Amino acid sequence: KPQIALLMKTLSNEYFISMRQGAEETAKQKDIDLIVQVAEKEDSTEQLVGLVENMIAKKVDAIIVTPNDSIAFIPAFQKAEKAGIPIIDLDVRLDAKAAEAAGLKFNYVGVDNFNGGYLEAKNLAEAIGKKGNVAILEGIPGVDNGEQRKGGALKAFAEYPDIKIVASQSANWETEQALNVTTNILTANPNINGIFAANDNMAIGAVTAVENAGLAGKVLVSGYDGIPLAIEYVKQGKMQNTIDQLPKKQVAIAIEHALKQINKQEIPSVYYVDPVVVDKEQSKNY
Ligand SMILES: OC[C@H]1O[C@@H](O)[C@H](O)[C@H](O)[C@@H]1O
């Protein structure tokens, strides 16, 4: 009965709670013994590497890890290759050029976050009337997934000359911070009518601001991940859209990909699940 480790940067997020649950359903279905270990602060890279190497030391059958740093985990991954343990890079993608440099072959599973943001910004751009002033809420500075979604958004508003990015501030993926930041951003420009948030938590924090500010219906918010509560807000109209990243399908493919590599079959180096744009008429399905 093969023993697989899932090593996660956090569980404080609802999104990962969702992925962990889907992970355990796939584990049960495929008769896998599944070992979940979570890092303590979301941003502590060292401790997570700590965790990966432990699993190497325990000679676990496979490891699925959601990295904490695109580069820090490379020596970890090429230690796992030397211990002949297959290993799947989930969610956050390791630096390709850096991986190239060190002779490392590694396998990712996720989504195009650039595309996801492009698709997500584009929908809100259209929603606020191809016109207005937008403000971007970003994740923890540096993380690829966050910046990718930003670059994605930026490309999209660049297509609407009557939409101008007037505010961009990091809310670090936390609801409570995005409420603070959004409030301070809404006072700063009263001509803001649309809010792009790079995850579902900051979108929720951003909606609470506009409704606090008596601005419901007058500023439209987009999010990213597709968590239940975001989806509900989309139903009620409190949100314009979120992008369902399919976190269960992702980690399902991760576990499916580990198993193949345990049985010495080839997997793609990259696998991008196809995200869904979730707005009120696609909301009918959620
Ligand atoms: O932890 C905040 C976010 O981290 C990203 O890497 C994931 O794609 C999810 O959007 C998650 O919600």
Q: Which residue, judged by its Cα, is nearest atom 5 of ligand 1?
A: 145
Nearest atom in ligand 1 to 145's CA = 6
Q: Are residues 90 and 207 in the same domain?
A: no
Report in angstroms the alpha-carbon separations of 112 from 91, 146, 148: 10, 11, 8
Query: What does the alpha-carbon distance between residue 107 and residue 180 come to, in Å, rounded to a whole number?
Result: 38
Q: Are residues 211 and 256 in the same domain?
A: no
Contact 92, 67 (CB under 8 A): yes
- Residue 276 burial (C-beta neighbours within 10 Å; 0-12, 13-18, 19+): middle
**Resolution of the experimental model, in Å, one decimal:** 2.7
Asked how this structure was determined, the answer is X-ray
Q: Are residues 218 and 256 in the same domain?
A: no
Here the CATH number for the domain that contains residue 192 is 3.40.50.2300
Parent domain of 89: 1-109+248-271
Q: Is the CB of 172 under 6 A from ligand 1?
A: no
Query: What does the alpha-carbon distance between residue 227 and residue 21 come to, in Å, rounded to a whole number?
Result: 13
Q: Are residues 282 and 150 in the same domain?
A: yes
Q: Are residues 104 and 141 in the same domain?
A: no
Contact 222, 214 (CB under 8 A): no
Residue 243's CB is within 10 A of a number of other CB atoms, namely: 27
Q: Are residues 209 and 235 in the same domain?
A: yes
Task: Tell me the CA–centroid distance for residue 144 and ligand 1, in Å.
Answer: 10
Query: What does the alpha-carbon distance between residue 63 and residue 106 come to, in Å, rounded to a whole number?
Result: 12
Contacts of 260 (CB under 8 A, 6+ apart): 266, 267
Q: Are residues 77 and 125 in the same domain?
A: no
At 84, the amino acid letter reads G
Q: Are residues 126 and 50 in the same domain?
A: no
At 276, the amino acid letter reads V
Indicate the top mutation candidate among 43, 144, 148, 225 to test ligand 1's pocket, ranked by most ligand atoms within 8 A of CB. Answer: 225
Q: Is the CB of 13 under 6 A from ligand 1?
A: yes
Q: Are residues 226 and 98 in the same domain?
A: no
Three-class DSSP category at 277: strand
> Using the 8-state DSSP alphabet, how is residue 94 labeled?
P
